Curated annotation (Swiss-Prot), chain A:
Cellular compartment(s): Nucleus, Nucleolus
Self-association and partners: Component of a heterotrimeric complex containing IMP3, IMP4 and MPP10. Interacts with snoRNA U3. Component of the ribosomal small subunit (SSU) processome composed of at least 40 protein subunits and snoRNA U3. Interacts with the SSU processome subunits EMG1, IMP3, IMP4, KRR1, NOC4/UTP19, NOP1, RPS4A, RPS4B, RPS6A, RPS6B, RPS7A, RPS7B, RPS9A, RPS9B, RPS14A, RPS14B, UTP1-UTP18, UTP20-UTP22 and UTP25.
Protein name (database record): U3 small nucleolar RNA-associated protein MPP10
Role played: Involved in nucleolar processing of pre-18S ribosomal RNA. Required for the early cleavages at sites A0, A1 and A2 during 18S ribosomal pre-RNA processing.
Residues of the full protein shown: 496 to 539 of 593
Disulfide cross-links: none
Domain of life: Eukaryota
Record-stated family: Belongs to the MPP10 family.
Protein's gene: MPP10
Curated annotation (Swiss-Prot), chain B:
Keyword rRNA processing tagged: yes
Cysteine pairings via disulfide bonds: none
One Gene Ontology molecular-function label: snoRNA binding
Locations listed in the record: Nucleus, Nucleolus
Description of how the protein assembles with itself and partners: Interacts with snoRNA U3. Interacts with MPP10. Component of the ribosomal small subunit (SSU) processome composed of at least 40 protein subunits and snoRNA U3.
Function according to Swiss-Prot or TrEMBL: Involved in nucleolar processing of pre-18S ribosomal RNA.
Alphabetized Pfam families for the sequence: Beta-prop_WDR3_1st, Beta-prop_WDR3_2nd, Utp12
Protein name from the UniProt record: U3 small nucleolar RNA-associated protein 12
Family statement: Belongs to the WD repeat WDR3/UTP12 family.
Gene3D superfamilies: YVTN repeat-like/Quinoprotein amine dehydrogenase (2.130.10.10)
From Swiss-Prot, chain C:
Taxonomic classification: Eukaryota, Fungi, Dikarya, Ascomycota, Saccharomycotina
Quaternary structure (record): Interacts with snoRNA U3. Interacts with MPP10. Component of the ribosomal small subunit (SSU) processome composed of at least 40 protein subunits and snoRNA U3.
Superkingdom of the source species: Eukaryota
Record localization: Nucleus, Nucleolus
Additional detail: Present with 8070 molecules/cell in log phase SD medium.
Summary of the function given for this chain in its UniProt record: Involved in nucleolar processing of pre-18S ribosomal RNA.
Organism: Saccharomyces cerevisiae (strain ATCC 204508 / S288c) (Baker's yeast)
Protein name: U3 small nucleolar RNA-associated protein 13
Positions of WD repeats: 10-51
Amino acid sequence: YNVGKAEKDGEIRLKNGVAMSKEELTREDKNRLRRALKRKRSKA
Amino acid sequence: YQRFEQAAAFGVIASNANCVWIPAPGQLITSALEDVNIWDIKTGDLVSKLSDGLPPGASDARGAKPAECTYLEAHKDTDLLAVGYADGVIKVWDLMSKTVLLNFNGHKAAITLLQFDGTGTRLISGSKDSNIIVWDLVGEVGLYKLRSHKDSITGFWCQGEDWLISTSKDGMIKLWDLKTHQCIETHIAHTGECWGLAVKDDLLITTGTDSQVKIWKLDIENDKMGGKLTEMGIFEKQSKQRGLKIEFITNSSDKTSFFYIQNADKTIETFRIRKEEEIARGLKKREKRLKEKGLTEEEIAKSIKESYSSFILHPFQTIRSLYKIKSASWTTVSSSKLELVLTTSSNTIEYYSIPYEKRDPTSPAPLKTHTIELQGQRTDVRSIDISDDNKLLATASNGSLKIWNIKTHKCIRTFECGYALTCKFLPGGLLVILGTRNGELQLFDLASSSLLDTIEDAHDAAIWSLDLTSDGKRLVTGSADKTVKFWDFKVLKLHHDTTLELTDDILCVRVSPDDRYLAISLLDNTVKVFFLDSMKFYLSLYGHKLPVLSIDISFDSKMIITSSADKNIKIWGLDFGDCHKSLFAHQDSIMNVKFLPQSHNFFSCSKDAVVKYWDGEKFECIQKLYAHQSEVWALAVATDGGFVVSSSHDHSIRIWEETSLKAGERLMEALDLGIAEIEGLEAYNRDMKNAVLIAVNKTPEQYIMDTLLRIRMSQLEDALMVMPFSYVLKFLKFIDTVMQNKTLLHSHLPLICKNLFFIIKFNHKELVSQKNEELKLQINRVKTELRSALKSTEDDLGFNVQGLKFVKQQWNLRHN
Amino acid sequence: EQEKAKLQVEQEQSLQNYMSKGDWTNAFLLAMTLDHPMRLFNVLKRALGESRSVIFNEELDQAISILNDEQLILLMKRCRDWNTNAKTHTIAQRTIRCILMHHNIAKLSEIPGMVKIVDAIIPYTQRHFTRVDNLVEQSYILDYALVEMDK
């Protein structure tokens, strides 16, 4: 078993094993997570 | 080149802000775009005008439009005025000195609401960025920020240092604990937005987008984990538009209370609060009525709850205005009459009185007692003109023609006209000719102060342009009926002379200063040049993607400039009709272009709110003039070139006058600090029987521990080898002190283990050789609980491993 | 749709109030219904930290006992994920231990999908057991230091 993507569409699950619901996030935390994903896709 | 700066700005009575009434009908503090006006309601004359400074057009002036005023709050006791701006700036003004005291910058968007505390030492500000910040005026700093809401702050209520109820444009009511800076309660006020909030004792009233109004009861001491706010009832107001403001007023003598709900339409709806004796009397009556009707007791109880609002509220009277209402404010409450003042979205102030006796008012409609209208115009000015003597300024809008004095900035005369589209003075400055949108030509006289002549059938459609010959005896008018007509001035009436029928609609007509050419702009993107003397077609100018809106011919009849809706200014040679230069001038339609007299420099204004000063020989912008907030419709240049006038959609007429440590090294620093304090307390405790740590707000153990966490594991083993032995005995003391805190020990048990064991392995030889008996007891203590902490985790791990195989084994047996 | 929305606003607010107050038994129940995985992790993390000073405490243990089949599958899925990371496995093990000591082991087996979740927890827990055990061995250097210092 290996941690993968979030089964639910409203959550972020990282390979670190940490899950994050979009509802519980503050606005500032949602921004950096959005930018973090952008870096991952840019080089990919 | 010689610099242009704004000499004066006028024409605005009340902009898009609130109004602050100050008792002596007293005065009213209103916004004038980036300035603040203080009007005397009785006389109707401007008392003062607050302007920060830095006139537009000056070199030190900024390169964007100034931020306008959006909210006004005054502390009556202390005579301070807070002004919020559209860029999120607050400026506290000294009303007596008329100078800025404080300048707060903590909001990213326009400020929606300001409120001094009762004592006048704190200022609470909400903004469109959804934040509420509490400011300290004596400290000139922002105390704390309240960051729960997710849209613009529409209202809030804070009458004490303990609690603050706030409303936002996301439809929530939030109750805040101002000692802890957290939101305690959150309710959905309305399904969409929530626009109003007024609180009186327990009673709280909120308005949303629709006509529904909710009633809440405010039990602050409820402390039930909820229910400090409970919804009581819903009552419908007459207006189906959103209720923007709610304000309460209490009559001191009788203790009767009223509130209004300012609507986004032209109405204000006043309400009265029924006294408790009235409520009981009404309840007993209606219960008798319902009982006589045969309803059950339980049904009556539910019906009373259904009609709960009707017992406490009573629609009192509806104030109706001719213009949409922008802001309102209670002024005076008395047993005789009830007074309200408001500003409209059409540049005026209105004062209303409601005389009443007991429950219901005496007169069917409120009495409009005062108004301020003379020093402005209700609609936006579409054309302006300056008399040949450069002393008067005519400004023609939809419904009125007002004539101003450029020196005093005061309107001298006002005439009622149609939908004026173009105006020009006649020579001598004593007459003005208008072309309205219905096809009418109207001619006024300033001295007589009346309309001399009207030509209803001058054109079949809107007279879009209007020009006079230099002699002043001939008038050329172009219309959207696709004709240019010529008129003569004979003693003074207008007589139609000739007609010239064109192919398409006419947007502009210009006659050259030499009276030799007539340039006509057509809706088919071309400008046609004629010979005025013979009316022989001479040229057609092509090159504009979109229609030409303005034309202007130079003082020597050599160049012609044209400006279009395609954002370009083209400069043509009138010898052949060739385009010398095409400038991409503005970011929107360029409405007007004017040559400076006796020069080739020219001005331009656009819908992008910028006026630009250009060079006619170099085709370069000399100066960008940022003062207006909205479209600049009209522009005018004095005959001497000494000043320029521009009027905009924002009701303002503006006159422009010509004027490091590495890891391990950091660890040693933390060990020196943390253990110096630990030893101090330990020595202090024994006898009884710093700034850094206080600033960070951490214990000595946690402060050292956080430094260990920040060290990368690849740098950690080398960071420990550089440590001298004396720092190792310090490290063993830090570990010993950590062991007493079981929460820290199990939080970072693995990291303590690797670092501790590596230290002992690295310098075991020097550790064992020491004959310190205190060191023996530290290692002995650190040993025991390190095992017990380690064994505790292992016992849990081993137990689940055997437990989980058992589950897997039994599922196998039951399913194989 | 308005009454569920109104309720979800109250539960989100109440969850924040409980966490700030430190009412973890009530924060746990709201976090599970709302399905807020971090707040669940923080509530369990800082509830465990207080336990250091049966498993979690008398009250929060009771809350875990009354969980229904749907909630258990949700909670064990988080425990499976937290277990894969050595920096957060300690919280997962104590949560797993509480479930076994307050639920019927037979009943846990029939729940559809539990065995596959359990199958993914065992291999990681063995890796965590091999470690920590090795840390116990390494801790005996303190014995060898003490006997040397006695000499």
